[PDB]
Every structure is written in structure tokens, then in C-alpha cells.
Design a protein around this ligand. Structure first.
Ligand code: PRO
Ligand SMILES: [K+]
Ligand SMILES: [K+]
Ligand code: NA
Ligand code: NA
Ligand code: NA
Lengths: 788, 799, 166
């Protein structure tokens, strides 16, 4: 399968209908139906693409997310601009098994939720438009597509995985018109000498030529980052059939691709016949990479500590159906945090993501979804083989990619009643060998399958210091031991869960030490210190290739119904809606140079303790020195120093006054000659609280048609229970509706309290509603919401 | 099977878990799973059987009912009382495609939602118990079952049908222990001499004998209606393998089975070997039936007008998963209405229903679900052939059954891109020929496929006088024309929708004063479909049909459609969404007004029913003479309005409507008491009825608000009432606006029942709507919405 | 294509003491038919206890691929000398699937015997406006009985079977 190298892609976003469930046969999608008839049910839902079956039910706290069939239908207005041209449906990606129909004709199918693929529907379209059936469709072509994400033990990935195996047309679906002769595949194979002074580019192509044209003229042109030609060659009378090597060239003193200054060349290809001129473009970059034996990673001859994260294709409100603009925002957000490396979750991701990594300067590890459970039969193995080949062939032109991953946690059993380590080793080695045959210039890898750690080029164990294992102060020691076991060690996945907006006084060094092991309270306060510690240690590990935090952004998973946000993995440093957590700024203060400054506690409204306690205040900043003010009184300047943990020396112990406090931080970064500041306001409560006794519910603010409701757990005397984690359940009756099923701690109708509180927004619909608030063992509370 | 065992038959009702959806493979049903693990999801629901996927979502107003896969699982504690015995799973019925697993071993499958079937799991159980995998199940055997009601154009019935194609284990699933030798089938073939004085009974059996036992002693005994022996015979050393004719006997002066006095004989069979004594019972009845060419129907030599209804396997709160007690109540309710004939919807029904028809005296038409759509391929045709053979073979012994139906509305197209009448004719005749090969003693039938009306023994056209066609006063004339087209005419399906508790003044003949002496005017109500779907119209429609039937001596009979409101996927916009409301009984068994019309015509036990028990507020002008109808089988009835006698009237079916028992009376503004006293001379009995009704003379403007109030309480349950009122607070008594209920807090709406008072979205009945709230001893707020009106709120607190 | 390859999942067994022969070794006939014809003709006969009354049931299955709605069918039965003993026409019958065409009683029927084999002939005709099609089928009246632990009787007389194989 391929992504189609085309210039004229039409995204089919509008005028779709979606049915959750199965039809009795293709005839049900296209048969005549009168209003009010038996054919007029089931009732379909109008939607736009991309669309995911699971946009809401993945994080709905009371249901298993839907795994099963669903249908889409639309009417295509066909108008091919090319004489005797082709009509192609090009799928960026669809989950998980897809069948495609033109009227009643099955035209294509696909198994695999994460690779790109396409279907040539030229003949089906011509036959339909020439048939008696075209008339009642008014000259349009009925397109019906079935997607299915039914559970399937003989299909990867496994339902044991810690993520949703989503369904639907959740990546763009494109209508692509082609001339008679086009390119089926374009491989831009480039290499760079060790001394960086000579680049080699090989331009290989496969032709798409169903009309069996015998000759064409093909022009290959290569342009540099400034759009200047560096090579141009026309091949007259070439045979445009199957594979052809078009050009091999040497480029002296190439512009290099780098994570700080990503620079790309552009290859432009034209196919000419008497009846067509067709041009497309493909980008590539020159760069040299090397993993040292028992040592670090080098990019273009310089040691580069990989500063990595992960991401899932998942987002608030849409699940996997993210748009291009959402992807652009998220990747920019990563770059602004200082990320230079990403493992793209457990599957091939949208080509849009790969382009953004090429453009932003982010190295890529990308893997096939052989993720837990063991090993299935022949259909299973063919899928893994097919998805690995599809991934390498589809993404090999991207300079960001340095690692093809072959699987994750393959030592995790129980999708089958046997677990055969030797068979897993055998299939693993077959995939490794196949990847090296397809692309000898990149490394293979796996994560966490020790009995396969001799097979791949690059290996990652499981090291979650301070979360699943020991204390986070063991991080460096464990890494040193682990790195000794394999030729090339690279650490993917570490961190900890934090319930966004939950903070903990016990996690701080308050006067009048905090443990470094999993905070059973899942506070941001603990994860911040855990990340701080990891980043400080990495500055003293010169042998270290690098690491990748897991994940960048909170994402939904079916195996955690009981998390503070149900069905959400909360290890992210960013909320599922892009809202940064406190931990985002720790990475940013360590990994970027643009001046910034962040007092911890922007979402911490009420601290607590004894009167005149000296409360710890942390500032995460890359400034050379910072001065803290508490209620206008300077608390002293402090100099930044990574090794002075925590907060790299920028910590203070200060008395808060009862009631409201204002904390201000002023920083200077000498290199930039820049001053930056931050300010937060925090209340300080000295009253102690008894057991939770009631929910106080009130209107916190309004914006347009929207109301922000706040819930506070209080004891029998009305004192805030600032440590409570009790689950709050929201219900509504009336004209409004809850803004929920977003997978965030402020967009959930069932959510654990954060320091005794919970927030949710109500869409009022310009009418009247009553909100009810439940919590186990407490009286149900109520709030009326009227509109102006 | 059924009824071939008895007491070694265990209903598996408890300790089941249900998953809406599909597993990735049988291993996910039985693999080790620790709490909090990836194996601990998806989360299953504990359930009791019988169970239906669609108990709630069939009538849920905002979703398409679920058609797809679902799984059940339990742990069987097996302890066979018989030496070297069998373990059998016996399905009364499951929808639609079913696969059965013992541990990881697939042991059986079935396509067909309405026939009975079984699987012998002895070997799979033994193989599992002898393996190392048995230990972690602690001596129990994991049983996993997949049911699937996915839409399937190559499977009957068609999704064009006006009923839900339900999914799940919605009839009893029985664990049956058996000895080595038992009966696979018992065929009791009985016939009667022309003078009815001699009965012949042939006892044919098929043996189940997987251990190949060579000889057994088999005893046949027949007991009469008083449980006295009339025949007893032991066959020593018979071969208990395959088919055996066990007995042929003549019973002189047999007690006959009849619709007024249903009387059954019992055949008792015992199979003995050195290691077993196995005894079972099967019932049968002697009766003679005859359809006259271009004439009526005869039971036991006497003309019998078939007084019929229909029923679906569907009920409030459970969809198809009705219990035996629910079925006994419903069939008893039919008999109390005077029914003597039923077409069991569009499919084979539970054997319990057939047993109740035999015991209550209700003749039966039972058909396969070849119901609309055209004709599919080979798998489709094999299913239809198999379901016809299964139905005849499984239900042959029931004396109630007189007709095997081969299909319904087979002229209804569009499940395929072709519709070939000649192919449908060819398959229809093949099914007809097959039924007669299997059972030559009964008639075949179809309903509404004119181009096949030459193939079957008995034919029904489509006659919906006053609902889908013309006026109900054409009923008799249409029936006369239709009966001439075929040798044996039988009319199944007629009636009309009525939104229970919705009544209509315009449906009655009301008298207004026109200004010496004033004169009287009244519009005559139309005899065509009431666009308002009032009970008032259906009552008159039923009344007319039954009156005409007393003057149709050539008529075999008819069957009203249906007895009870039932859910249907093709009517999202009905007053009760997704409910076919043509019943005379609500989906929860509550009688509608129309129930008593049938009862007054069809029974002899004295009864009397004033129309309007669910009509709280009538309306009109101050001195209007409002029509009052009484439906009663009493010879004479006297009406009292507010204590003032309005005169005695004599019953006369042909004095339409109400068989002469109608009055025109002035109501006073406010509350009125209407009392009716009747006497039935034959029984020398007096009976009475009384209703109380308000009378509103104030006219109302457009709907402007919803007035919401707590109408009454019962324990933890609150009955909430909604009343649509105009800008001056006057009740909008003709309003049909849809009302939506919502709740937040500790309580829950008692909704998705498919009744006009158990629905969270429902059209108002005369401007009001009721729903019950389960308060859970806490506090809730109810919101009430209606298009274009301000949303109203009602608080519900607990003590 | 004909094939007599050995096949253990096909009867007879190659263990048998005869050749499982291959080829078109019995006549292959080209048969022209009208629209409506008979697919099967079943002549079911029984003989009274005293041999004096014979019953013949004539059942047929129609071949009717054009779905003709009505036809006229004649049943005729001829004796051993071709003398008619029964004739009846069913006008406007449905020539589709199975039909019982006739049930009749023959008094003092001539019996079939091993010394005097005598056969009746049943003749069936299907007519429409576009066809007249006639075919014939034979049957014989005779009574057989195997006595429990005893000999064989043909038409009430003990007949010792003098048999062979081929
Ligand atoms: O063979 C029959 O038709 C009778 C009817 C009831 C029991 N068996
Ligand atoms: K969920
Ligand atoms: K529904
Ligand atoms: Na899977
Ligand atoms: Na179907
Ligand atoms: Na053989």
C-alpha cells in the first residue's frame, strides 16, 4: 500500500452520514427509500470527516467503548480533469478493517488502522454512471464504506494494550484524480559522508500505468532549501512501467537537516506524454546519525542528548479524529517545550505528523502495533509484516525518522492459551531482517522484551523510577546497569500520573523530606519533582543516548475505568485538550533558551498548614537568577543551578498570611539581556477540616451561553476538605447540557475531586436547567442555572 | 426438543453475565484475569435469564435498537444423576444466530430466532474436566454463548418487518440431564371417524441412543381427561434406535377437544434397561376440523366463528424475554376476552404459549418468519425450509394448531435489487408441498400475497376497513368480495391504533342545543381513520366489525391485530415512540377501552363497562347531551348520571353502536358520576360499573405552559402529572404535543416501558402526560420540556 | 468428464469384488420437452386382503420453469390388453410442484405374477394453449408377504424364490 504521491488531493470532509452498527447488505445503503417507510430506519447521523466512532464513549465513565462495525455514505460529484484519467480514493488511515463500495460493487478492503492505502475506483465509477441506476442518483456516485474495530485476537494491536483500538474514518479520506501515467511510489534515498561534505541522492520510482503507455518523458529536478535548482535532468522516451531508477547524484557541501535548523531539499518529478503533464514533489534531508557502542547518540557528528516524548493519536472531543490544525498546534507545543525526539506511540501515525517533525526538527522512532499478548497465526503475522513494510516504504523519505520499532512489551502474555518465547524470537528476527532489507540506513528497536534484546539494533527496557519501581532517585543507577546489557541503549517511557489541578502540601519541603516513591495521591506536585530529578541527572550522563517521557498529552485508554479521570492515562504533562500542566514548565525550563519563568501553583487556589509555617515555593525557570516576592516583600535573589535540587536552586520557604496571598517572581537571563516575570494568587487556609459532609455547589463564572460550575467538598462546619479525592458525579435536567466526556479533570461528569473541588462547564442553550451533584455517602446538592 | 423430558430439566436463570458486543476470540471468555488487569475490561453486566439485548433500547426514543453480537457466560455445576448419562443444553429460543462454547471448544450453532434446538455437550464436558485447565475453575465448567441479531438480508425475517428482530437468550435455556436411552421425538398422530365416535392414535418415536444400547423395554400408556388409563402396553426387547412405531390404538367414544371445554389425553412413555427407568409425558387431543369451500369453519361438526387475535413475543421492560408467569397472565387475559383463535405473530412461539392454547381452548395459526422483502439465495431458502420443518415437527402434537403459515406480505419488495414473482411462487409451492408431506392433517396459509393465492389451502388478503382503506362500514362488503376469490378465506389482521388514555369528543355523537323550544344538532363522526388515534375511534371500529360478523354466516372468522401493544423499529414517530399501538391491551397488560368491546360481544360471564375509565375530563357546551357508551353483555342496562336515571335500554348487537346501550346526557360543570347497572337473565345476575368524570365548558387557546405536579405517591414511587394549559390557565384538552421528561438527582424515571405512562418522550393525551419516578428515598428535580414552551421544573424530596 | 478415480470417501469400496467402472456406460439421451412436463410420476398401488380390490394413487411432480399458472391434465389407466379402466381430466389445475392426480379403486384387478407378469399402464397428458404432451408409466398389482420365521408368499400363494445375481 502507498499514500499516493499526488498534487491534487480533495479532502472529502462534508456531506457524510454515519451509522453505528452493521447493514444487512450493501443493498441497504443504496436501495430506494421513501420517508416514513421501513427503509427509513435505522436513522443515520450527519457528520464531517475525519470521524471516530469513539469521540465520546472512550471516556464516558459508564460504558465500554464501542468495538464493532459502522458505516459511512456520501454521494460523489465526479469530474475528472484528465483525459482518460483515474479516480482514486486515498486513505490517510481508517480503523481497523475497512471495506469500500461504489453503489453495490465491492471495490477494495484493508486491514490495519494506522497505515495509508488507496483504491482505484475508475472502472466501478464508469460502469455505474453508464448504468440504469445512475439516474435516480442525479448524476452522483454513491460511496459507502464499512469500518470495523471489533475485538480480534488475530489482529494487531492487542486489546491488552493501554490505548483505545479506535474505529472509523478518523484520518482524512482523499479523492485523487490522476492522469493516465503517474507515480505509485517515490523513494528519495540519500546518504551523507562521515565528514558531512558529500551527499548522495538516488531517485527511484514505481509507475502507475494501467493503460500500458509505452513511452514518456520524465524530468527530475532537485531544489535546495532556498528553492534554487541544484540538478535537473529529463529522460526522453523512458518506459513508464513498474520500477525505474531516475537519477543518481552527488551533492557537495549539502545543506544539512538538524534539530535546531531543519533544512529540506525538494525533489520535483514530471511525467509528460502527448496527453498529460503531471508533476509532484517529495522532500528529503541530508543528515548523519550514529549510535555509539555502549555510548551516546550523534547527529551530524555532534553528541545530541535525545530530549523525547511520546504521543497518541487522541484528543478531547474527537478521539483519533484530529484535524491538521490540531496536529500543528500539538507539535508546535512540543517544540516550544524543547522536545527534539518523539516515539509516535505504538503505531504509524498520520503523514501530517511526520511532515511536522521534518519541519520542526524532531527525530522520530515509529513502530508497528505489535503491542502485547504474544503471537498469533498466519493472518496475524502477515499483518505485522505488511504494516512494517507499509510503514518503512511510506515514511522512508522523512529525515526525522531514525528508528523503525518492531513492537512493544512483547513479553506480555495471554491473548492466546500458549506463550512461546522461541516463536516470538523467530518472528522478531524475521521482522528485523525484513526492515534491514527494506531500509538499511535506519536502526530497528523494541521496548521491553528482554528475551529479544539481542535481536534489534536499539533496545529499551522498562525504567519507571519513582512510579512503578523504587524511588526516582534510583534513576541514574538503574539506567547505568541497564545500558551495560545491550549494544545501543535508548530509554523510552518514564514519568508518573498526575490528576491535573490536584496539588499536595506533603509533596513539598515545608518548614514547621518528601518521599521519592509513587505518590499514591497522583498530585502534580509529585510528578513535578520526579521530572525535575530525571532532567537534573541527565546532565551528568554523557554516555546516554537519551530518553522519551511517556506521554506528552493525556490520552484515553480502555483499561483504566477507575482513574481520577476515568478511562484517561494521566501521565501527560499536557491535558487532553492541550492545557499545559505544571510539569510542562519543568521540561521547558530545562530544555529551552527563550526566557521563561513559572511559579508552581497556577492551578493551586488554596494552600494549607499551620500559622507561620514556612511554605516551600518552587519556580521553574531558565533564567540565570530569580527574585521572589511574597505579598510585595522580597524573599531574596537566587541563582539557577540544575544540580541544586529541586527547582535548580530557585526555591524559597516563605510564610503565607491567612487568606489571599500574591506571589511574584522576576527573572533575568543575561544571554538574552531579558527580564521576565510571573505572578500567582493563592489563598492560605489554617483551619483544619473534619470528614467530608456536603457538597457546596456554586456558579463560578459565565462566558456567553456557558456557565462554569464549581463544587467544593466541606466538612460538617463548612471548612474546605482540601485533601479530598472523592468522586463527584454531575447530572443535569432542563435546557442545558453538561460539557463532559472530554477526558479532562474539568470536562468529566464523573471525576475525582482535586483538593476537594471539581469544575464543569454547562452549555445553557439560552434556557433554564438544574444541575445535581452527587458524592458517595453525602447529600445530593443542587444548583439552578438560568439564562439572561 | 420439548416437551420430551420434565424434571431433570433445570432452567438456567441465575449467575449469568452479559456483554453487549463481541469478544476477540473464545479465549477472552475463559482466560485468567486479575482485578485491575487489561483482562478485567470490557466490563460485563450481571443478568438473569431469560434476557433480551433490547429490553430497553427497542422503545428508547433516541437510539436505533441494537442489532449485533452479544455474549453470555456462566459456570455450570455439573452432577449428572444418571449412570453414564448425557448433558444437553436445550434452547426454547434465542435470537438470531447463536454459537455455544464449552471452555474453548465450539460445540454447536443455530440460525433462527424462533425455533427450539439443543446441543449434547457430554463429550466436551468430559474432555474439559479431564484436562489440566479444569483445575482453576474449581470443578465447574465454563459455558460461553454468543448470540447475534445483526441485520442480515439473507436471513428471515426481514428488517422491513413491523417488529423488532430481537437478540439474546430471550427464552428459557435448560440444562437437561438424560440417561443413556431417551426420546428425541414423540409424534402423537390422532384422527377421528366421520361420526366422531371413534378415535385413532398412533404413537411414533425417535430414540436418542448415543451409546448404542441394543434392547430396551418401552411402555406406552394413555390416560383420559380424568387421568384414567385407557391403554397400556409394554414392548419387551425393542430396538431403541432411530424411529419406532410404538402403538396404534382405537379409542371409542373419545372425549373431544373444544374451544369451550379443552380436554386432553396424556400419553406416557417409559424406557427401561438394567441401568435406567426414564418416563416422560406428551399430551394430545381429539378434534375434527373442516373448512367449507366458499364457506365457514367447522370444529367437531359444528360451525364455529373464529374469534381471533394476534400476539408478539414482546412485553414492557423485557422485550422478548417474557417469563412463564407473564405468558400465563397474557393468555388468561385473552381467554377472559372471549378469544378462541390466535395467529402467533410472524414466527414460531414459545412452547409455553402452545401449551396455554391447548389448555385454554384457543385454536392456533403459526407461521415461519418469511415476512416481507422478496426472496434470497440458498442459505435463505434453507433457513425457511428448516424453520418450517422444525415448527411442524416440534408443535405437531398440539390439538390447538389448525394452520401452518408459510409467510406474510411476500409481495413486499426491496430487500434485494430484484423481485421475481415466479421464483417466489416456486419456493412458496415447495414450502406448501413440504408442509403437507410433514403433516397432511392441517391446512397451510399465507397472508397478503395475491399472486400466490392459488398455492395455499387458506388465504387471507389485506382488509383494514376504517384504518388503511376506506371506511369501516365497507367491512362486510369488502369481505364478501374477497372471500369469493379463493376456496378458503380467513381474515387475519384488522383494527386501528389508539394512544392509550387519549379520548376524543369528536369521535362521539354529541348533541348541541340550537335556539320557543330549542332543537338539537350533532355531527356524525366519520368512519375513516381518526388522525388523532383516539381510543374513542377504535372502540367504534371494533364494535362495527363484530356487529357485522353476526350477519356473515359464511365467514370462517377473523383475527384482530394485535392483542397487545408491541414495539416496532419502523415507527419512531408514534405517540408512544417505537410502539405499534393497535392493541386493545397496553404493553404492560393494562386493558384499553377496546378490550371491553370484544369482551361484551364474545363472553357470557356477566360484565358491564362504561366507556371512559381513563377519560378524566370531557368537554363541550353547558347543555350539550354527551354520548355515553356502555359495553356489556347484559340483556338490559340502566344508566344513572349524577344519581338521575336516564332510562333502561335493551341490548341488541345490530343497534349500533354499543348494541343499543348508548345514551345522550347532560353533564354538569365539574365532577360527574356515571353509574350503569345491568342484568343478565340467563345467569340471573346483576352487575354494575361507575366512573367519575369532570366536564369543562371553558374553551382553550394555544398551549402556553406545562403545569407539573405530584399527583400521588406509593411508597418510594411518585406519580408526576403534566398538564398543557393556555395563557389563561385553561387546560388544552385536545393537545397532542410531545412531552419530554428529564431528571437529575437521586431518583430515576420509570421509562422505556413502551406505554403512554412509562415513556420519557410521549405525545400528550388530552393535554396531559403521566410518568412515575423511583425516588430512591432521596431528592430529585424533574424537568418537563415541550417544543416552543418554557421548560417546567418539579422538585421531589423524601422524608 | 467422467472419473472413476479411487476414493475412500465414495461408495462402493475398492475392496469390493467388482470393478468400479468408468465412463458413459449407459445410454445418454437428448430429451426435448414442452414448457410444462412431469418431473416424477409415482404410481402407488395396493391390493386388498382377498386380492379382489386394488387401490392406485397417481402422484406427480411438475417441471414448470416458465411458471405457467394453469393446465389441463388427463389421467388414464389401461389394462393388460390396453383397455381403459379409468380416465379423468382435471381442468385448470396448477402445474407446479406436487399434485395428487387421482385415487381409484379397481375391482378384481389382474395380478402380476412370476408365471404371468401383467402390467397396467398409466397415461398422463398436460395440455395448455401451446402444448400437448403425453407420457406413460407402468405398474402392477400384487401382494407380497414374508412370514415370521417362515417362507415367502406372492398373491397369497407360497412362492420359493429361485434366484440369481448379475
Ligand atoms: O395428529 C393430530 O392432529 C392430533 C391433534 C392433537 C394431538 N394430535
Ligand atoms: K469508556
Ligand atoms: K428505539
Ligand atoms: Na487485537
Ligand atoms: Na433479515
Ligand atoms: Na470408494
Amino acid at each position: 500500500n502507498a499514500k499516493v504521491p499526488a498534487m491534487n488531493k480533495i479532502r472529502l470532509t462534508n456531506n457524510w452520514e454515519y451509522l453505528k452498527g452493521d447493514l444487512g447488505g450493501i443493498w441497504e445503503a443504496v436501495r430506494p427509500a421513501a420517508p416514513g417507510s421501513s427503509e427509513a430506519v435505522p436513522i443515520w447521523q450527519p457528520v464531517t470527516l475525519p470521524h471516530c466512532f469513539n469521540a465520546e464513549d472512550a471516556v464516558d465513565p459508564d460504558v465500554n467503548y464501542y468495538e464493532g462495525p459502522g458505516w459511512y455514505k456520501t454521494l460523489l460529484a465526479i469530474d475528472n480533469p484528465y483525459r482518460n484519467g483515474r479516480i482514486v480514493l486515498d486513505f490517510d488511515g481508517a480503523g481497523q478493517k475497512t471495506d469500500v463500495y461504489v453503489y453495490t460493487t465491492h471495490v477494495g478492503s484493508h486491514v490495519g488502522g494506522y497505515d495509508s492505502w488507496n483504491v482505484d475506483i475508475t472502472d466501478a465509477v464508469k460502469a455505474f454512471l453508464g448504468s440504469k441506476d445512475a439516474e435516480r442518483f442525479k448524476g452522483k456516485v454513491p460511496l459507502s464504506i464499512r469500518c470495523d474495530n471489533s475485538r480480534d485476537l488475530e489482529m494487531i494491536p492487542s486489546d491488552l494494550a493501554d490505548f483505545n483500538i479506535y474505529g472509523g474514518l478518523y484520518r482524512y479520506l482523499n479523492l485523487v484524480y490522476l492522469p493516465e501515467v503517474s507515480f505509485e511510489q517515490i523513494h528519495l534515498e540519500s546518504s551523507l559522508s562521515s565528514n558531512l561534505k558529500e551527499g548522495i541522492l538516488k531517485v527511484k520510482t514505481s509507475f502507475y500505468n494501467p493503460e500500458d503507455i509505452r513511452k514518456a518523458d520524465v524530468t527530475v529536478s532537485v531544489y535546495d532549501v532556498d528553492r534554487k535548482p541544484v540538478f535537473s535532468k529529463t529522460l526522453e522516451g523512458i518506459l513508464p512501467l513498474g520500477d525505474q531508477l531516475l537519477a543518481k547524484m552527488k551533492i557537495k557541501n549539502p545543506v544539512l537537516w538538524d534539530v535546531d535548523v531543519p533544512q529540506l531539499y525538494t525533489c520535483e518529478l514530471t511525467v509528460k506524454t502527448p496527453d498529460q503533464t503531471f508533476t509532484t514533489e517529495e522532500r528529503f534531508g541530508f543528515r548523519h546519525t550514529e549510535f555509539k557502542d555502549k555510548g551516546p547518540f550523534f547527529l551530524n557528528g555532534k553528541r545530541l542528548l535525545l530530549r523525547g516524548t511520546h504521543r497518541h493519536e487522541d484528543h478531547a472531543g474527537v478521539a483519533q479524529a484530529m484535524t491538521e490544525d490540531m496536529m500543528r498546534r500539538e507539535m508546535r507545543m512540543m517544540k516550544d517545550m524543547g522536545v527534539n525526539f518523539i516515539r509516535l506511540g505504538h503505531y504509524q501515525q498520520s503523514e501530517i505528523i511526520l511532515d511536522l517533525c521534518d519541519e520542526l526538527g524532531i527525530l522520530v522512532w515509529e513502530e508497528i502495533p505489535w503491542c502485547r499478548g504474544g503471537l498469533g497465526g498466519d493472518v496475524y503475522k502477515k499483518q505485522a509484516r505488511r504494516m512494517l513494510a507499509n510503514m518503512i516504504v511510506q515514511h522512508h523519505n522523512h529525515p526525522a525518522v531514525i528508528i523503525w520499532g518492531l513492537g512493544n512489551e512483547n513479553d506480555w502474555p495471554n491473548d492466546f492459551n500458549t506463550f512461546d518465547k522461541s516463536a516470538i524470537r523467530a518472528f522478531m528476527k524475521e521482522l528485523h531482517d525484513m526492515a534491514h532489507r527494506l531500509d538499511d540506513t535506519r536502526m530497528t528497536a523494541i521496548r521491553r522484551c528482554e528475551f529479544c534484546n539481542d535481536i534489534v539494533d536499539v533496545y529499551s527496557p522498562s525504567i519507571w523510577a519513582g512510579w512503578y519501581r523504587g524511588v526516582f532517585t534510583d534513576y541514574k543507577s538503574i539506567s547505568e546497569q541497564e545500558m551495560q546489557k545491550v549494544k545501543h541503549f535508548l530509554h523510552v517511557e518514564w514519568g508518573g500520573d498526575s490528576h491535573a489541578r490536584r496539588h499536595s502540601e506533603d509533596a513539598f519541603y515545608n518548614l514547621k523530606v518528601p518521599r521519592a516513591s509513587r505518590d499514591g495521591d497522583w498530585s502534580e506536585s509529585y510528578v513535578v519533582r520526579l521530572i525535575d530529578w530525571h532532567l537534573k541527572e541527565q546532565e551528568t550522563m554523557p554516555w546516554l543516548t537519551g530518553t522519551a517521557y511517556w506521554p506528552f498529552k493525556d490520552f484515553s485508554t480502555p483499561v483504566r475505568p477507575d482513574n481520577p479521570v476515568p478511562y484517561v492515562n494521566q501521565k501527560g504533562v499536557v491535558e487532553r485538550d492541550f492545557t499545559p500542566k505544571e510539569s510542562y514548565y519543568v521540561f521547558q525550563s530545562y530544555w529551552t533558551e527563550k526566557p521563561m519563568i513559572h511559579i508552581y501553583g497556577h492551578t493551586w487556589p488554596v494552600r494549607w498548614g499551620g500559622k507561620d509555617d514556612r511554605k516551600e515555593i518552587l519556580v521553574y525557570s531558565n533564567c540565570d537568577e530569580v527574585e521572589l516576592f511574597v505579598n510585595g516583600v522580597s524573599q531574596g535573589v537566587k541563582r539557577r543551578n540544575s544540580q541544586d535540587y529541586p527547582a535548580a536552586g530557585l526555591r524559597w520557604n516563605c510564610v503565607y498570611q491567612e487568606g489571599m496571598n500574591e506571589i511574584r517572581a522576576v527573572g533575568v537571563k543575561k544571554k538574552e539581556k531579558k527580564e521576565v516575570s510571573d505572578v500567582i494568587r493563592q489563598e492560605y487556609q489554617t483551619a483544619k477540616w473534619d470528614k467530608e459532609a456536603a457538597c457546596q455547589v456554586s456558579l463560578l463564572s459565565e462566558e456567553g451561553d456557558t456557565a462554569l460550575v464549581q463544587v467544593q467538598l466541606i466538612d460538617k462546619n463548612g471548612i474546605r476538605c482540601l485533601s479530598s479525592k472523592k468522586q463527584i458525579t454531575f447530572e443535569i435536567a432542563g435546557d442545558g447540557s453538561l460539557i463532559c466526556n472530554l477526558g479532562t479533570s474539568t470536562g468529566s461528569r464523573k471525576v475525582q475531586a482535586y483538593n476537594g473541588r471539581a469544575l464543569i462547564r454547562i452549555k445553557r442553550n439560552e434556557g433554564n436547567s438544574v444541575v445535581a451533584v452527587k458524592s458517595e455517602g453525602l447529600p445530593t446538592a443542587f444548583l439552578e442555572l438560568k439564562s439572561p
